[PDB]
Write a protein that binds this ligand. Structure first.
Ligand SMILES: *Cc1cc2c(cc1C)nc1c(=O)[nH]c(=O)nc-1n2C[C@H](O)[C@H](O)[C@H](O)COP(=O)(O)OP(=O)(O)OC[C@H]1O[C@@H](n2cnc3c(N)ncnc32)[C@H](O)[C@@H]1O
Ligand SMILES: *[C@@H]1O[C@H](CO)[C@@H](O[C@@H]2O[C@H](CO)[C@@H](O)[C@H](O)[C@H]2NC(C)=O)[C@H](O)[C@H]1NC(C)=O
Ligand SMILES: *[C@@H]1O[C@H](CO)[C@@H](O)[C@H](O)[C@H]1NC(C)=O
Ligand SMILES: *[C@@H]1O[C@H](CO)[C@@H](O)[C@H](O)[C@H]1NC(C)=O
Ligand SMILES: *[C@@H]1O[C@H](CO)[C@@H](O)[C@H](O)[C@H]1NC(C)=O
Length: 475
């Protein structure tokens, strides 16, 4: 460690903000949100300004160690701590500047920001919104580089595609601005795989002023129904969602916790009742619903508790997540939906694990996405499907067969997709840590992967940012 320590000790980074394993706070600074993992960094530093980021990077280059920026710490694979052991972790926590350009209605936030503080700042100062993940303390950099999905994404897009530009430090300390029209190759890979290419110092997002002061939420409960009835209900919901629903709806249909759903509507609250009537039309006669209204920012805080708070709503968790997407051209069939429900939630039976999962309705403005325009493949996404196992309360050891148990229940669904000729596709932020390179690369990036590897060779030839297991290799 001597080389890295001595180099860092000659920078201006505070000694109190430079930690190695002999530090009194090492265990705290290296603790992962994803408790199934425990990556061991070479060191963790907290830069106070852009020059200190560059100084830390230069020390990593001189020492021959990899570099991982740490933002909100939410990675489902502990990727911010490097994923693999031995990275220099650059904790971006001080980079929380917030500015608003009222001429262009663009919000600029620092590369170490979290969803809640930044959304709260923009709301309280300007009455504006940008799509964001549904959790108060997730990093904005770490979530925006993997698409993201929020309650407003069916009409506003993803956190990722609402980015207008970013400022990025490359491995050699050079700072560039990336956008669709400036350093487009870098912007391409930021939009899906940013951790493999640079350190995002600042991000600028488009923003939306809500048209209506009041928003609506709702629930749907089918009651005690059999599998065929529940599956038919999903098919009927899907048909409504693909033919009648406006883009301003959101809907989550439970996988674990069936047969129930919930959602939001961001159009005129006086138009909701007629739209909700059309949705519940075919549902079985045991169905009941609820509806409420609240002002826009109150609703935001009900969807993501404590957006304006001071602590994470979601404590660290030992879990294993899997996730697939379906597109508009090949959505659920009766057979594929039945395979999913029959062998995941309806067969789940463990004392040491609990089940979690849902189907988030997509569609809407995913119709405007082109896969050739950014690394992440997500054009015409129609559903986001999440199936997750969580360690039971009171246990501390993830079971040796937990991954196999979770994968087995989700396998009949995959086989039915294969039978129907439907590609297996994923969603970057919902990292499945058990996938092989052959699997994650095509599921996340489709046929963009070769281009991504070329850009990797061009922008990080020495591999400084090659850290976690899903890092983009060079060509
Ligand atoms: C924990 C969690 C995650 C989560 C969620 C709710 C909870 C409780 N809800 C989500 C949702 O509604 N929608 C969605 O799309 N994702 C949701 N997630 C997942 C979350 O978005 C991802 O796990 C995300 O990657 C987490 O980001 P975060 O910033 O919190 O985590 P990290 O470990 O520190 O970093 C993740 C990766 O991003 C790279 N990174 C971070 N900062 C930078 C900068 N400045 N520049 C470049 N790369 C950066 C890290 O290196 C790491 O690879
Ligand atoms: C839907 O909106 C209602 C508000 O109309 C939310 O209701 C709050 O729910 C919390 C649950 O933790 C209760 O403690 C509060 O008493 C409720 N507030 C009011 C004013 O009734 C509800 O949480 C929202 N649900 C979703 C999923 O967004
Ligand atoms: C957060 O915002 C909601 C909605 O305006 C408000 O009811 C609540 O009091 C706020 N919480 C804090 C801690 O300010
Ligand atoms: C659930 O698992 C237990 C063993 O832990 C078993 O006894 C029980 O029959 C199972 N329930 C089923 C298969 O419905
Ligand atoms: C730093 O690396 C980038 C990415 O390869 C390159 O474009 C730039 O010219 C380099 N800066 C130098 C050599 O000063």
């Amino acid at each position: 460690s001597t080389r890295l320590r001595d180099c860092l000790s000659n920078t201006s980074i505070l000694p109190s903000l430079t930690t190695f394993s002999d530090a009194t706070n090492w265990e705290t600074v290296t603790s992962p949100w994803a408790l199934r993992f425990n990556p061991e960094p070479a060191a963790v530093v907290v830069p106070r300004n852009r020059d200190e980021v560059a100084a830390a990077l230069a020390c990593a280059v001189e020492a021959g160690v990899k570099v991982s920026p740490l933002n909100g710490g939410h990675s489902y694979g502990a990727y911010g701590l490097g994923g693999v052991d031995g990275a220099l972790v650059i904790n971006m926590e001080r980079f929380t500047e917030t500015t608003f350009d009222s001429a262009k209605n663009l919000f600029t936030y620092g590369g170490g920001s979290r969803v809640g503080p930044a959304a709260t700042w923009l709301w309280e100062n300007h009455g504006r919104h940008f799509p964001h993940v549904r959790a108060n303390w997730v990093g904005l950099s770490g979530s925006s580089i993997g698409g993201g999905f929020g309650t407003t994404s069916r009409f506003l897009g993803t956190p990722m595609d609402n980015l207008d530009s970013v400022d990025v430090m490359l491995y050699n300390g050079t700072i560039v601005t990336a956008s669709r029209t400036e350093n487009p190759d870098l912007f391409f890979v930021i939009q899906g795989a940013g951790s493999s290419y640079g350190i995002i110092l600042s991000l600028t997002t488009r923003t939306w002023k809500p048209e209506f002061e009041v928003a609506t939420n709702f629930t749907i409960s089918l009651g005690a129904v059999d599998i065929d009835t529940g599956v038919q209900a999903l098919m009927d919901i899907q048909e409504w969602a693909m033919t009648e629903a406006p883009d301003t709806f959101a809907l989550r249909w439970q996988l674990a916790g069936e047969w129930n759903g919930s959602g939001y509507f961001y159009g005129n609250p006086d138009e909701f009742d007629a739209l909700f009537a059309s949705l519940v039309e075919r549902l079985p006669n045991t169905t009941t619903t609820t509806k409420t209204t609240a002002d826009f920012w109150a609703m935001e805080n009900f969807a993501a508790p404590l957006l304006n708070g001071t602590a994470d709503t979601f404590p660290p968790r030992s879990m294993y997540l899997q996730a697939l997407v379906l597109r508009k051209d090949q959505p659920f069939t009766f057979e594929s939906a039945k395979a999913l429900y029959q062998y995941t939630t309806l067969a789940f039976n463990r004392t040491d694990l609990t089940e979690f999962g849902f189907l988030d309705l997509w569609g809407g403005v995913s119709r405007d996405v082109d896969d050739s325009k950014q690394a992440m493949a997500y054009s015409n996404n129609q559903w986001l499907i999440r199936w997750e196992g969580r360690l039971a309360n009171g246990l501390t050891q993830w079971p040796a067969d937990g991954i196999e148990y979770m994968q087995a229940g989700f396998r009949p669904f995959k086989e039915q997709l294969k039978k129907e000729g439907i590609p297996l596709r994923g969603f970057v932020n919902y990292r499945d840590t058990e996938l092989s390179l052959e699997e994650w690369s095509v599921r996340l990036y489709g046929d963009n992967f070769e281009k991504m590897k070329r850009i990797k060779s061009q922008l990080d030839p020495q591999g400084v940012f090659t850290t976690h297991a899903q890092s983009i290799p060079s060509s």
